[PDB]
Design a protein around this ligand. Sequence first.
Ligand SMILES: Nc1ncnc2c1ncn2[C@@H]1O[C@H](COP(=O)(O)OP(=O)(O)OP(O)(O)=S)[C@@H](O)[C@H]1O
Ligand SMILES: Nc1ncnc2c1ncn2[C@@H]1O[C@H](COP(=O)(O)OP(=O)(O)OP(O)(O)=S)[C@@H](O)[C@H]1O
Ligand SMILES: Nc1ncnc2c1ncn2[C@@H]1O[C@H](COP(=O)(O)OP(=O)(O)OP(O)(O)=S)[C@@H](O)[C@H]1O
Ligand SMILES: Nc1ncnc2c1ncn2[C@@H]1O[C@H](COP(=O)(O)OP(=O)(O)OP(O)(O)=S)[C@@H](O)[C@H]1O
Lengths: 184, 728, 195, 344
Amino acid sequence: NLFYLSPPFIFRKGSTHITFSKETQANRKYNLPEPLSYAAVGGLDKEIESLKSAIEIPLHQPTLFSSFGVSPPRGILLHGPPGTGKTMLLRVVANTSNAHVLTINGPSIVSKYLGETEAALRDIFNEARKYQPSIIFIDEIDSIAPNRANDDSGEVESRVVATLLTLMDGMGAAGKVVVIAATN
Amino acid sequence: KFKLPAEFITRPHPSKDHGKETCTAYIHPNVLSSLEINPGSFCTVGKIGENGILVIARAGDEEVHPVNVITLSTTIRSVGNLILGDRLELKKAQVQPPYATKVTVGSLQGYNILECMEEKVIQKLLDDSGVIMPGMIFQNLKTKAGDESIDVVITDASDDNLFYLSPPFIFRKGSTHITFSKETQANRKYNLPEPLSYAAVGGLDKEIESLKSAIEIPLHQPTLFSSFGVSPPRGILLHGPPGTGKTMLLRVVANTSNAHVLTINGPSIVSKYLGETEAALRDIFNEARKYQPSIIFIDEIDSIAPNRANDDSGEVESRVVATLLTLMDGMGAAGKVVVIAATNRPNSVDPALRRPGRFDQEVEIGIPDVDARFDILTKQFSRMSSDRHVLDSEAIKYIASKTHGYVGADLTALCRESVMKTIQRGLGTDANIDKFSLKVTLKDVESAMVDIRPSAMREIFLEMPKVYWSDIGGQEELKTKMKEMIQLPLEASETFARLGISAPKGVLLYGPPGCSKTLTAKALATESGINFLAVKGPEIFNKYVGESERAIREIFRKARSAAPSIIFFDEIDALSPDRDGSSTSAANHVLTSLLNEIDGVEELKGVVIVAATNRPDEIDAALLRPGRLDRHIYVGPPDVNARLEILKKCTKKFNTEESGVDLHELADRTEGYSGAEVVLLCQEAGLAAIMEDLDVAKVELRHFEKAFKGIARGITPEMLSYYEEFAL
Amino acid sequence: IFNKYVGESERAIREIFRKARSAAPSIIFFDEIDALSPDRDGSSTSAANHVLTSLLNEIDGVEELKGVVIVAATNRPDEIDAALLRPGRLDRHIYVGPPDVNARLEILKKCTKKFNTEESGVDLHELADRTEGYSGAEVVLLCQEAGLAAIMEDLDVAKVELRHFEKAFKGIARGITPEMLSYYEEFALRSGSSS
Amino acid sequence: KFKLPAEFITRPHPSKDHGKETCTAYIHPNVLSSLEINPGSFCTVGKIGENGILVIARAGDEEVHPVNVITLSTTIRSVGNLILGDRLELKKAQVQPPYATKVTVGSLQGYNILECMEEKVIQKLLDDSGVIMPGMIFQNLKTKAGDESIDVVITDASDDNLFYLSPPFIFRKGSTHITFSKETQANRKYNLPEPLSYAAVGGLDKEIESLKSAIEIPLHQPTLFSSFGVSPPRGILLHGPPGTGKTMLLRVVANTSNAHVLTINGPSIVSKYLGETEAALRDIFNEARKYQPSIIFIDEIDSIAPNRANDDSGEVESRVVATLLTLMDGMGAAGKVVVIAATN
Ligand SMILES: Nc1ncnc2c1ncn2[C@@H]1O[C@H](COP(=O)(O)OP(=O)(O)OP(O)(O)=S)[C@@H](O)[C@H]1O
Ligand SMILES: Nc1ncnc2c1ncn2[C@@H]1O[C@H](COP(=O)(O)OP(=O)(O)OP(O)(O)=S)[C@@H](O)[C@H]1O
Ligand SMILES: Nc1ncnc2c1ncn2[C@@H]1O[C@H](COP(=O)(O)OP(=O)(O)OP(O)(O)=S)[C@@H](O)[C@H]1O
Ligand SMILES: Nc1ncnc2c1ncn2[C@@H]1O[C@H](COP(=O)(O)OP(=O)(O)OP(O)(O)=S)[C@@H](O)[C@H]1O
């Protein structure tokens, strides 16, 4: 039982009483992680519809857009009050789609000195390119791309924004990858 | 090869605390052998770098005892008050303890053992103890009735020593004189680290109960959230004014809840620099989960995780969040911890640490009220019985009534200062005095109140020059109105919650210069005491950007500390002078903040707000919108009878009776004199008297004539006008 | 919204109207529009110059405003900007008076919410005509002064007295005085007629 | 002990012709040792934050070759559009790239190679090249009887774990077919960076030729002014409302001119420590002096060089403007250096 999220049992034929039930979830005592699906997102049906369109169009069918010689609408941005289903919408987009979910964490992607921040961004976007379709989530993109007009911005913000500008405007026209940003 | 560690951890001996094991420390066999300590041999177990408990070492099971873990029977721990989590140190005992001859055994319950138990019980327990050490507790001893149990201790022992916490002895049946006692604690001369209890921190009852709920839910009933499924409240932020008792409450939770306490986080950490400290911290929360239901305290959460004002950060704030996001695992599996933070100033933590899943719950201790302070003083003074004699019960409501504004740390300070002053005056009245005849009298305490100012005054700065209604001549109408309109809704809040009355939130005092506005404000502040916080225009404003906004929001933040309470904005016309009606360039932020706050305060929650002005139309109309500050009281020039009361007060030590100075002439000649000028006329009379013949005995009418001929009054196109208009 | 801020000078009005128009029919309200934007034609010249422009550019323009009526309120109608009175922004105009004797009966009933003056004390129905010159928010003042006086006699739990309402009558003089009757009727001979 | 640079400066080979030095990157001996890139071994060089180009490492003369510099041929630089002065990474590749089967070759000019050149020329070029990657341009190849010169492009390469900006392939005469084409650019599949050119800029014709003159004469023909006894014009400023294409001009000037290209991206040089913004400017202008000719770009000059007399310009702005003034005209000399700036 220890170090196992749930203890299996080796199903064997002959005496296993397969009693079907109307419950729509696994046994509650163990509480295996419940998916955060679309039916737990109520209140934003129109907004979720718009998000769905914005994700599908660059994610699944970028090729037919790319025949026109101008890059898809890869960059989606979520903003609004800082309490209204922002990270939760990103999480549901992660769960529902079968697209490889990467993640651009704010603090943890950056180590120290040089060639580490740009290395992280290059590596993650390259992996999102190898495995397709893929979604690149940047929750609270503000914490890593401020205006550069505030005293908050230093070297690291300049690194992150330069690398993102180099990458996101470079890849395209075949990659089935979307970048979704959210901000307070 | 095995390596002997330098530190160890306490965990509970899993079996019932009886038999020879009651004085045995089951230790990892590798540790014992590497220490060259044979099983069944004596060793001293105690906190790192401190005296310890002599106990027999025994070899544990490697699958049961991790390398650093040590199990002491509850009997052993209760001697040192060792909490499960205390880091231990191990040393071999050099000399065998002596045999006991006489032993005194008593119960913490205070129940007469002679009336409940036979001495065979004490013989059994002491024989099981083997090497007696005073302070051990024998726990839950069931009576013959079966429906009861008793707690018992070695109150004293003697025989007819290095690093031993209390003098130990060896029990040998038949040769020892067992004796009963009613004493609930061991011999005071043992200087034991006595436990800490809720019988000491009493005075915050409701928050104590809420804390007990916040320990019930994550320790005892984590299973009861697997059903209902929903994420549990597994982060607590016990904020409050400094010195209110937060650290004491955390300490009582640690010692009276029987969870394992994961070691205190503290402001200190290896290096206090990013990168290095990030792993050294995660280790504390990695220690969590594995142990049976625990409690990790992160006291001073503002010093470990500061606000990140504009760029002030190592990595520690985000490191705390990223780690708490795993510490919040539980109640599906590994629901075996809760985190309790403490702080003086919760808005100075990074606000990301109060988000759901993080410290999503708070306790919010306040400032002790009038009866809270009596609770505090009673429980505190209970520690003295032979040296007080003056508490009886009364005179202590007197201390608690006159000691307004003390936060609880200041009452402890008051007690110690009274003790020190008692000793000082005892040795001052005579060259030598009997130490044990010394006793802290109400004379001592009331004298000590002079020196011990509240700690609140060093952050809540307030003048309150102590005026009374006897010092405000006339204004009977205004005293009545202030009673009605501020003091009743302040104190009678519950009755208005019953009666549905609406308290006049906001009273603006407007009137000519030199009338009773601020004088009545002060008298109200001190007479019929309430908390009374004020600000000034020239101090909320600072050269740097945004420092004025922060000041106003911080003023309201600190104002939240108590209730009932009056906020006093003297000369409010210099908080909203301009930048709203005109010159609206970029700097009306102070008005924005104040006018935002004035709405957030609830209508009868307990806080009321008073303001004053002699320039009524200079106040921005935003403040006089109803719900904000729409109530106005006029403080006009005093009438004939008020002026005579002022004259009578301020001429008190003038022998007006002997000199024939008939006040009823001055009170009418001084018509239109606005307050201060009636006072001035009496100062000038006195100077006229002194200049005539220094070493004056009395003042006389001619001096008052000289005073009158030199005083001028106010402006009638500005006074009695522009206030009559403002009345419309 | 009238205050001078980046998002209040000419923006917040547009956002409010956009929310209201985007919704089902709406009765958007403009409490004290007279005090909000004064005449500013030589008398009572405020310094905003922006909010009235936003209203003028929003109400009269391309927007659909299918389900929208802009109601407003005032106590000094002579101060309204002339750009509002004329048809095009406001084209309906009516007058609201303080409650009559029966309206005053039921406003007296409304004031009390947790008092038993009727059975114990004086009937609320008795007070119907006793209150003269007391506006809908001033019969409230009489009742609330009586309630404050109630907590002065027993101070814990009591009904009120007739003399509580009598003191309400003294301490609060006749509110609706002939001055406002005259000022209105003077303005109404203009608003009511073509003059 | 020796400290290897964290980032490296691109530079050109002294040899301008095509040989077995083409695909070779000359790196300092100590750096070769420190990454254990044994001479002759494969290494990947590519801008910070982008995929690398496979290049075969040789050594530089240890006393005249700066530690920062890798020297690359125009053919290799054409792949990633590496402009001189770009900061490159350098990382060992423990790999042997695959052999070729079919290699496609085209020409910018669109002329028929069978008509313009003999297939033995292309065969020799590829054989000597050592490596084949789509996107390479072999410039200035002479036509029949020296009629003219043509630029030849490797449009695509095909064979019937590291990550590369262009697939590496090897040429093995006879066994890899040199199939001709007419596509004047590399295959669009690859997302190879495509040089921005003046043909993409609209209008501004007279301004474009003014930029050409003031960039060409100061950098590529200074002895004409030294002959005429006048100094060269070391400065151009572009001003006009936003959105008119000012940065487009700077990027095309960077990508078209053969010079060391350095950029002060306004706030990118700024630091909160007392003298560090000024030290960034001194290092940029000394690098420009060191490697000549050099173009220094300053987009939004007004962000780092305000009026110095107005109220908000304190000591920091004064010191940054003084540094710019003294590095442009002071007790120090300029060299074949031109500074190009843009401002709204
Ligand atoms: N329709 C909804 N709108 C808002 N919150 C919802 C909704 N449905 C569920 N929630 C809950 O809202 C909680 C908080 O929402 P979050 O998106 O996590 O907050 P947030 O979006 O991260 O806010 P920030 O500070 O802008 S990142 C989640 O735990 C959800 O369970
Ligand atoms: N019943 C009591 N209630 C409150 N304080 C008490 C009480 N009895 C004694 N005190 C003492 O009051 C002092 C309060 O100190 P702390 O608990 O450390 O203050 P605190 O609230 O934690 O403030 P800090 O700034 O956060 S360390 C301690 O010395 C207590 O022992
Ligand atoms: N019985 C009294 N009635 C009126 N004023 C008195 C009386 N006794 C003393 N004073 C004087 O009244 C003065 C207070 O006048 P205030 O009206 O409060 O001053 P103010 O200029 O109107 O505004 P502030 O709040 O004081 S700055 C003090 O200087 C007292 O000396
Ligand atoms: N002929 C053209 N003229 C101008 N802009 C063009 C032209 N062709 C394309 N563009 C686009 O317009 C923009 C021109 O670059 P910008 O930098 O936006 O101009 P700029 O604003 O003057 O330069 P800044 O302010 O320093 S970023 C780019 O987004 C180009 O893709």
